[PDB]
Amino acid sequence: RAWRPIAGGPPAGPLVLAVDFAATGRPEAAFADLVARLDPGTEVWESLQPPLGTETGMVAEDYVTRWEEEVRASGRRIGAVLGFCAGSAFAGELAVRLARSQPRSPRLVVFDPESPTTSTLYYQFRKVVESLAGVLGEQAAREALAEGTAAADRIGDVEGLGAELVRVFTAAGRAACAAADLDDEFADELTATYRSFVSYLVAAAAVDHVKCWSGAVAVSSATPTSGLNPLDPAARAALVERELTFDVHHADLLRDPGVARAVARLLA
C-alpha cells in the first residue's frame, strides 16, 4: 500500500493527502503533529514509501503514479494535498494531476518546500551520519564523512551525488558490522532506509516544482536555510501563490499551534 490513514473522518468526505518521508520519532515535527491540532473529522492519509528495495528502478513518474493509482482505485475525492520539505515536490505533482482528474481541484499547501539540490543532499547525509555515530561507531562515521565530503566536492549533479552518498553510507554500515559490533540485520535496515530516502529525494528533485508550486500556498518557518527562506524575496513571490510566515524553527513547524490554526482555516 502506498497510503496510510493517520486521521479518521466521515465515510465519503473529502480526503487530505499528506506527503513526506515517514520516520516516527525523528526530531522534526511531522504530519501526525499537525493533524493532531487540526479540526476534528479531517480525514488524512500520509504517503508511504515503496517497500524497502522496491524503490530501486523507480523515477519520479513511477513514485507519483503509484500514489495516484491508489487514490484512483479508492474512488475518493481529494480536497487538499499537503507536503513537507521535498515531499512538497510530490505534493505539487499530485495536486496538478488531481486538478485534471477531478471536477474540482484540491487545495495545495506546502510546508518549507524544497526541491533537493546537491547541497541539501549533502547536509542531510551529514545529519544522518551524525545521528547514527553511536551505532556506526567512531571509525565508520568518520570515514563516511570524509568520503562524503570528497564526493560533494567532485560530483555536481543531484542524481550522481545521491548514488555515491548511498554507496558511502552502505559501506559505513558494513564497516560498523565488521568493526563496531553492529547487528547485521539492523545494519541492513539502516542502509536500505537511507537508500530509500536518497531515492525519494532524487526523484523529488526531478519534479518540475516551478510548474507544480504555482498554485501552492506555502507555509514557512523562520530557519534561514529551509524552504523558501534562502530565495530573493521577488523569487519567493514568483514561485508560489501565497506564502504565510511563522516565527518557529523548521523542526517545530508542523507542531506549532499557530500553524495548525492557519492550516485549518486554509482547509475550511
Automatic annotation (TrEMBL):
State the source organism's domain of life: Bacteria
Question: What's the protein called, per UniProt?
Answer: NcmC
